[PDB]
Amino acid sequence: PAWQIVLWAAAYTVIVVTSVVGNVVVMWIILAHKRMRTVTNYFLVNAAFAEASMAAFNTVVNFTYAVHNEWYYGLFYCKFHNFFPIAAIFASIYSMTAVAFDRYMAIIHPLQPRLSLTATKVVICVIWVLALLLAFPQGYYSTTETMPSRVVCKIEWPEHPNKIYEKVYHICVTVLIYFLPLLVIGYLYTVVGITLRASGIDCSFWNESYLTGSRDERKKSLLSKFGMDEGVTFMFIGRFDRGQKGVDVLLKAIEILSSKKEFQEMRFIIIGKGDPELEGWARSLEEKHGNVKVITEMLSREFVRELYGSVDFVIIPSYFEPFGLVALEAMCLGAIPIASAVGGLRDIITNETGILVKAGDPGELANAILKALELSRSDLSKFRENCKKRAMSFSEQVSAARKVVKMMIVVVCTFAICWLPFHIFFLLPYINPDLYFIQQVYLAIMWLAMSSTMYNPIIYCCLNDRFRLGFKHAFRCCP
Ligand SMILES: C[C@@H](O[C@H]1OCCN(Cc2nc(=O)[nH][nH]2)[C@H]1c1ccc(F)cc1)c1cc(C(F)(F)F)cc(C(F)(F)F)c1
Ligand SMILES: CCCCCCCC/C=C\CCCCCCCC(=O)OC[C@H](O)CO
Ligand SMILES: CCCCCCCC/C=C\CCCCCCCC(=O)O
Ligand SMILES: CCCCCCCC/C=C\CCCCCCCC(=O)O
Ligand SMILES: CCCCCCCC/C=C\CCCCCCCC(=O)O
């Protein structure tokens, strides 16, 4: 069916041209602009070079040899045709693995040193050396030979009764360039994507701009709704439990403070439900003291935003706070956090943006509450401004990192999809020989696998403003 061959040749040429043009433009965008020269972009340039080289130097003969099963192209090209794609795919997928590892280090272990640019050039050279070494056996054993009357290019391992070495080599290459790097990148981006999503906040909602009036009028109206007169107002919200959210630590701190004269000047609002003994202890402290209020009913997020914008301080005595979104919610609304120095709370709150204490120590928490009462004698506006600025700038870095990580996840998923049918096609004989319309299926599977060399520049242009601007500059001639 010659018309099908014409359509297939057109599709393969579309692969070649799109891959070469887009990857060359990506290399120009990164290398020619000093702002673009980063660790991540260097690994991306290495991957773009590997993919453009494979599309430029293998696609045409792969198509022609798949369509016309006689080798006319010489011995050295037979070796290169069996050698280069393994090295190129290895170099590209491990450049992507290095990008994911650099992101995981910057986000999960910020204190630990990362690669310098020269270190990344060294890593890229090591990657290419390992790629060439892994590809070497397949190119070394390739030869042209009559089979028995017409020339073919074929991999000829030394004759062994079970061909065990060639089989183990193929399995190892498939693991090293597909399954293992995908598992590693999947772990890295799962941890990173969960940690970033758990640290995000909706700034369109948790925003002081939707409150009305001065903070003092709001706090007075709130205390009046609770039946209390004006005072320095502390708020807790969370589940009542032992060993987790710390409401028991806050209740012990309230009992410690209750004997002091300073307790007269404080007000407490404890919101949550859970362990009945803790609920009964909170109701006992509420009836015992006129400056304590407890709310076990569920509240709307609008009412909680009103509370965050009215109270003076929010107490977060968590034993365990991996992400600390509640601290961002309070700080965005101008409440000053008083929190255990654990996890995301320790990462977000600073000495200038809150008060931090050891988790599980009621006496240190009572001392921090007394320190907050001492701070309340003076104006707190600069403190709340620092809390708001810190919460905004933190949210901000999280959002940009989420964009970059989403782009890289789209890249890795496109790679996994494009290469799965190819490796399945070459692993099927080991579990079921079959292979008896195979040529039409092979042209489709090969087209999909090699199409992977053209998607990344398209992906960068859609999901990255800098690459989009670089593509606009490269194509300024066009409308
Ligand atoms: C060179 C060719 O390789 C296959 O065809 C020959 C036999 N070879 C298994 C074998 N090797 C022996 O020594 N005996 N049998 C196959 C194979 C090799 C390594 C694998 F991981 C999976 C399959 C290949 C490989 C890739 C890859 F490697 F990047 F995926 C991509 C492409 C291209 F995109 F251009 F079309 C072409
Ligand atoms: C917007 C601009 C649009 C421009 C549109 C045209 C772009 C053509 C450029 C590169 C494609 C060709 C790259 C090289 C392809 C080589 C084909 C080949 O013969 O491969 C040699 C290899 O050694 C064994 O075949
Ligand atoms: C980016 C760098 C790319 C370099 C590619 C170099 C070309 C590789 C092609 C074939 C290498 C395999 C060599 C096999 C030699 C066999 C000699 C013999 O059997 O006598
Ligand atoms: C040290 C702090 C530990 C915090 C643990 C928090 C609980 C979550 C931990 C592991 C669950 C991982 C499940 C990932 C499944 C994929 C989810 C997805 O696709 O988005
Ligand atoms: C034939 C199968 C090909 C598989 C790859 C498909 C092409 C993917 C390339 C670009 C698509 C990128 C879209 C990613 C989500 C964008 C979300 C958004 O724009 O907000």
What does this structure look like?
The chain has a domain at 208-395: Glycogen Phosphorylase B (Rossmann fold), CATH 3.40.50.2000. Helices cover 64% and strands 8% of the residues. It contains 16 helices and eight strands. The strands form two sheets. The protein has a six-stranded parallel β-sheet with strand order 5-4-3-6-7-8, sandwiched between helices. A two-stranded antiparallel ribbon has the order 1-2. Helix 10 (325-332) links the parallel strand 6 and strand 7. Ligand GBQ is lined by residues 58, 62, 82, 85-86, 89, 138, 155, 166, 169-170, 173-174, 177, 423, 426, 446, 449-450.
Radius of gyration: 32 Å
Give the strand line-up of the largest sheet: 5-4-3-6-7-8
What molecules are bound to this protein?
the ligand C[C@@H](O[C@H]1OCCN(Cc2nc(=O)[nH][nH]2)[C@H]1c1ccc(F)cc1)c1cc(C(F)(F)F)cc(C(F)(F)F)c1, (2R)-2,3-dihydroxypropyl (9Z)-octadec-9-enoate, oleic acid
Assign the CATH architecture of the domain at 208-395.
Answer: 3-Layer(aba) Sandwich
CATH class of the domain at 208-395: Alpha Beta
Structural class by sheet pairing and helices: alpha/beta
Tell me the series of helices and strands, N- to C-terminal.
HHHHEEHHEHEHEHEHEHEHHHHH
CATH superfamily of the domain at 208-395: Glycogen Phosphorylase B
CATH topology annotation of the domain at 208-395:
Rossmann fold
The residue fraction in helices comes out at: 55-70%
Largest sheet geometry: 6 strands, parallel
Note the beta-strand portion.
5-15%
Ends distance? 39 Å
Family: Belongs to the G-protein coupled receptor 1 family.
Cytoplasmic side: 28-37, 102-121, 193-406
Protein name: Substance-P receptor
Transmembrane segments: 5-27, 38-59, 80-101, 122-142, 168-192, 407-428, 439-463
